[PDB]
């Protein structure tokens, strides 16, 4: 599925990311929009490690997922890697909420520090009322 902008800005909220962790909503969005153009079908693989990042907030298999063949992986949201390639986001959502419940915070996302850290990321919830 891809989500268009306020539908999705509206639905990270009511599933309580707005804030999380002190982490803005417009962050969650900036990371998805960078991370998948909004697209819950969103999928990259990473030869380095054997690891893929799946879904619209591109979480990785070697330690947040388990998709069945990435080694010495980790399942720290303990679910499915494609319990993350869904329509619905309830799984997304809480298996990124456990992702910056770690030190690094939602800096464990390389894109987020490129195209979010510091900048000015109004625009991905103006308008959205929200």
């Known amino acids: 599925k891809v989500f268009e902008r306020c539908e999705l800005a509206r639905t990270l ?28 079908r969103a999928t990259n693989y990473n030869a380095g490690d054997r690891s893929t ?17 990435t080694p010495g992986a980790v399942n720290a949201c303990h679910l499915s890697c494609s319990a993350l390639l869904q329509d619905n986001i309830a799984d997304a959502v ?13 800096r464990a996302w390389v894109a987020w520090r490129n195209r979010c850290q510091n900048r000015d990321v109004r625009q ?7």
């Open 13 to 40: 909220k009511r599933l309580g990311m707005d804030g999380y962790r002190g982490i803005s909503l417009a962050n969650w969005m900036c990371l998805a929009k960078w991370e998948s153009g909004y697209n819950t």
């Open 124 to 130: 991905y919830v103006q308008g959205c009322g929200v």
């Open 53 to 69: 990042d799946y879904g619209f907030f591109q979480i990785n298999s070697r330690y947040w997922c388990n998709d069945g063949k």
């Open 94 to 106: 809480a298996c990124a909420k456990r992702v910056v419940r770690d030190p690094q915070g939602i």
